[PDB]
Design a protein around this nucleic acid. Structure first.
Length: 79
RNA sequence: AUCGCUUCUCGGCCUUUUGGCUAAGAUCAAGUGUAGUAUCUGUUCUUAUCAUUAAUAUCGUCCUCUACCGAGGACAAUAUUAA
């Protein structure tokens, strides 16, 4: 319950932006962003893994439907 | 009384049906064996079909485009809560 799906990411968003946006909720152990090597850009989503499930939970509550780089993002348990 | 439907009864067609001939064309009794096949009689096991819900989000195959890779679409159940 530590891994979150994060969608609706603008092109300018990268692993650094994600780390900065989610670290306020707790320490993070991993951030994965699937890439399209033909374009070299991400596909609009990523997975953020928190150290603690309780922190992942607080992040879902405060970040789902929040704004990042001008647009609304979607956040929920990945699985 | 008339029209339509249904049940029952009955008449008509029913050669639609017996498609040649001769010396009725001729003739006229029975088990011997086996194995093999078929039928019947019992000996044995018949009563029923089996297995939570609500809400939210999203590896394999097929098609298309671009240069094995990437993107998009569709299909195949998954997760959480509560008795």
């Amino acid at each position: 319950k530590r891994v979150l799906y994060v969608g609706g990411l603008a092109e300018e968003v990268d692993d650094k932006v994600l780390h900065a946006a989610f670290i306020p909720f707790g320490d993070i152990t991993d951030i994965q962003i699937p890439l399209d090597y033909e374009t070299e850009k991400h596909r609009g989503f990523a997975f953020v893994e928190f150290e603690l499930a309780e922190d992942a939970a607080a992040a879902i509550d405060n970040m789902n439907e929040s704004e990042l780089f001008g647009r609304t993002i979607r956040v929920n348990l990945a699985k």
